[PDB]
Amino acid sequence: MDFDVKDFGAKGDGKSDDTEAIQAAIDAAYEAGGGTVRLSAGEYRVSGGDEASDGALMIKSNVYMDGAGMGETVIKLVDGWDQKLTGIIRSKNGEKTHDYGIRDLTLDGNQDNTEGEVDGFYTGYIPREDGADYNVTAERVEIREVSRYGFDPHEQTINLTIRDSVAHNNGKDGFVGDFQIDSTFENNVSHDNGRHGFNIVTSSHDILLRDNVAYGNGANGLVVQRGSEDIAHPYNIQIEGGAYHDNGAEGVLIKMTSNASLQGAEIYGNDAAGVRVRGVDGMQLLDNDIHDNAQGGGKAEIVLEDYDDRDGVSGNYYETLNATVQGNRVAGAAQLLSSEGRDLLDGAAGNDLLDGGAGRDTLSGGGGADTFRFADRQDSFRNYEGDTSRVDDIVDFTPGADLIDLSGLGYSGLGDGYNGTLALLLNEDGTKTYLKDRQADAQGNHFEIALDGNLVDSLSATDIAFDATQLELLGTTDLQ
Ligand SMILES: O=C(O)[C@H]1O[C@@H](O[C@H]2[C@H](O)[C@H](O)[C@H](O[C@H]3[C@H](O)[C@H](O)[C@H](O)O[C@@H]3C(=O)O)O[C@@H]2C(=O)O)[C@@H](O)[C@@H](O)[C@@H]1O
Ligand SMILES: [Ca+2]
Ligand SMILES: [Ca+2]
Ligand SMILES: [Ca+2]
Ligand SMILES: [Ca+2]
Ligand SMILES: [Ca+2]
Ligand SMILES: [Ca+2]
Structure with a gap:
C-alpha cells in the first residue's frame, strides 16, 4: 500500500516545514497495516518536537520510507532549530517497533544553521530494559551534517541491516551500533566524521561488518568496545573485507570484546596503529593488508595488549587471550x-615482538629481525612426567637475525642445562632443536622451548638475551 507524501501536503521546496505532512503519510501507512511512504526528488524541511526523544519523524511498524535516491530526496532539519533532537527519523521509545526501514534518501542535520546534539537515524526500545526493535532496514541512505551521530541504531535492535549507505561530515560518529543484536553492516562508507567511522558498543553481539570503508574520520575508522559503563562486553563481532584508512587514530580498535575477528581488510595511512587490540578474549586477525600506519608517530602497525580497568568502572583487569594472527601482510x-x-602468533615482514604468555603457543616471526619473548619460566615447560603439552614452539627461528628474549628468567647462558644454564639440544631425527633447563623446579616442571629445524650448530649465545644488558645490546625491535 503506497502513500505519497505529496498527497498529504508535503512541499519538498527547501523552505516549507513538511514534518506534519510526512508524519501524516507515515501514520496512514501504519493504520492500513503497513505500506511504503514514497518521496519524490526534493528537499523536505523538518523540525523537532517538544522533547529530544520525539526526534523529527516517527517511523512505525510495517512502514518503509522510499525516496528517489541519495541526494535526490533530502530530508533536512529546518534552519534555527536549537534543541537536542535524537533521531531525524526514529522509532518510539518504549515501543518494540518492527519491520520498518528507509531507502534511497538523505538525512541532512544542518549543523551549520542549527545548535544542539542531533542524530540522524535512531532505533531501539528502552535503555537498560529487555525488549527490542527488530527487522530494521536502511538501504542506500546518506546521512550528513548532523551534529552528533549519523546512523545511531540503539538499545536494543535485533536484525538491523544497514547496507550500501554513507555517513559523512557528522559531528561525532558516522555509524554507532548501541546494543545491536544479530545485525549486519554491509558495503557502507563512513568518511570525514568528527570522531569515528564505525563504533560498535554497549553489549552488541553477533554483528557482521562486511566490506565497509572508513576514512578521513577524526578518530578510529572502526572501534569495537564495551563503552564507558560496567555492562556486558560485546561479543561475536566479525569484520570482513573493506578498508580502514587515513583516520585520525587507529584504523581498527577492538577492546573489552569477546570472539572478535578481523579478516581480509586493507588498513593504511592511519595516524596511530593500523590495528589495536586491548583486552580481547578471542581474537582472529587473518589475511589483512596493513601498511603505512602510525603516521602521527608510534612504532607499531599492530598492537596486541591488555586492558587494565582496575581503576575504572568495572574494577577488572582484562587480558588479551585466545589470539590467532596469521597470513597478514x-x-x-x-x-x-x-x-x-x-x-x-605469526609476524610479518617487520621486526616483530612475539610473546604468547602462559599456555602452549606457536610463534613465527616471518621476515625481518624478530624477538620471541619468554617472560615467565611457567609460560613454556615440560612437566614431571615428560608431557610436552605446555611447551611453546618457534616455527622459523633464524640465527643471526632473530632473538630469544629470556632476559627476565634468570638463566646465565648456554651450558649443560644445570646450575642456571640452558642446554641446546637436537632431537633424535634432527627435526627439532630444544632449549632445556634440566633442573626441575619444586613442582617438577622444566623450562623448555622447541625450535623447528636443526639449529644446534647455527644458533649461538648472541641469539639469546639472558639478562637486561644483553637485551639492550641485542633487541631487534622498538617495542621493549
Ligand atoms: O542510554 C542513554 O542514556 C541513551 O538515552 C537516550 O535517550 C532516551 C532517554 O534515556 C530516556 O529513556 C527517554 O525516555 C523518555 C521517553 O522518551 C518519553 O519522553 C517519556 O515520557 O519520558 C521518558 C523519560 O523522561 O525517561 O528517551 C530518550 C530517547 O531519546 O529515546 C539517548 O539520549 C541516547 O543517546 C543515550 O545513549
Ligand atoms: Ca521503538
Ligand atoms: Ca551549529
Ligand atoms: Ca598463550
Ligand atoms: Ca617479522
Ligand atoms: Ca624473522
Ligand atoms: Ca607460552
Whole structure:
C-alpha cells in the first residue's frame, strides 16, 4: 500500500516545514497495516518536537520510507532549530517497533544553521530494559551534517541491516551500533566524521561488518568496545573485507570484546596503529593488508595488549587471550602479546615482538629481525612426567637475525642445562632443536622451548638475551 507524501501536503521546496505532512503519510501507512511512504526528488524541511526523544519523524511498524535516491530526496532539519533532537527519523521509545526501514534518501542535520546534539537515524526500545526493535532496514541512505551521530541504531535492535549507505561530515560518529543484536553492516562508507567511522558498543553481539570503508574520520575508522559503563562486553563481532584508512587514530580498535575477528581488510595511512587490540578474549586477525600506519608517530602497525580497568568502572583487569594472527601482510612492526591458553602468533615482514604468555603457543616471526619473548619460566615447560603439552614452539627461528628474549628468567647462558644454564639440544631425527633447563623446579616442571629445524650448530649465545644488558645490546625491535 503506497502513500505519497505529496498527497498529504508535503512541499519538498527547501523552505516549507513538511514534518506534519510526512508524519501524516507515515501514520496512514501504519493504520492500513503497513505500506511504503514514497518521496519524490526534493528537499523536505523538518523540525523537532517538544522533547529530544520525539526526534523529527516517527517511523512505525510495517512502514518503509522510499525516496528517489541519495541526494535526490533530502530530508533536512529546518534552519534555527536549537534543541537536542535524537533521531531525524526514529522509532518510539518504549515501543518494540518492527519491520520498518528507509531507502534511497538523505538525512541532512544542518549543523551549520542549527545548535544542539542531533542524530540522524535512531532505533531501539528502552535503555537498560529487555525488549527490542527488530527487522530494521536502511538501504542506500546518506546521512550528513548532523551534529552528533549519523546512523545511531540503539538499545536494543535485533536484525538491523544497514547496507550500501554513507555517513559523512557528522559531528561525532558516522555509524554507532548501541546494543545491536544479530545485525549486519554491509558495503557502507563512513568518511570525514568528527570522531569515528564505525563504533560498535554497549553489549552488541553477533554483528557482521562486511566490506565497509572508513576514512578521513577524526578518530578510529572502526572501534569495537564495551563503552564507558560496567555492562556486558560485546561479543561475536566479525569484520570482513573493506578498508580502514587515513583516520585520525587507529584504523581498527577492538577492546573489552569477546570472539572478535578481523579478516581480509586493507588498513593504511592511519595516524596511530593500523590495528589495536586491548583486552580481547578471542581474537582472529587473518589475511589483512596493513601498511603505512602510525603516521602521527608510534612504532607499531599492530598492537596486541591488555586492558587494565582496575581503576575504572568495572574494577577488572582484562587480558588479551585466545589470539590467532596469521597470513597478514604488515609493512612494519607487530606487537603480538597474549596470555593463558593457546595462541598462534605469526609476524610479518617487520621486526616483530612475539610473546604468547602462559599456555602452549606457536610463534613465527616471518621476515625481518624478530624477538620471541619468554617472560615467565611457567609460560613454556615440560612437566614431571615428560608431557610436552605446555611447551611453546618457534616455527622459523633464524640465527643471526632473530632473538630469544629470556632476559627476565634468570638463566646465565648456554651450558649443560644445570646450575642456571640452558642446554641446546637436537632431537633424535634432527627435526627439532630444544632449549632445556634440566633442573626441575619444586613442582617438577622444566623450562623448555622447541625450535623447528636443526639449529644446534647455527644458533649461538648472541641469539639469546639472558639478562637486561644483553637485551639492550641485542633487541631487534622498538617495542621493549
Ligand atoms: O542510554 C542513554 O542514556 C541513551 O538515552 C537516550 O535517550 C532516551 C532517554 O534515556 C530516556 O529513556 C527517554 O525516555 C523518555 C521517553 O522518551 C518519553 O519522553 C517519556 O515520557 O519520558 C521518558 C523519560 O523522561 O525517561 O528517551 C530518550 C530517547 O531519546 O529515546 C539517548 O539520549 C541516547 O543517546 C543515550 O545513549
Ligand atoms: Ca521503538
Ligand atoms: Ca551549529
Ligand atoms: Ca598463550
Ligand atoms: Ca617479522
Ligand atoms: Ca624473522
Ligand atoms: Ca607460552
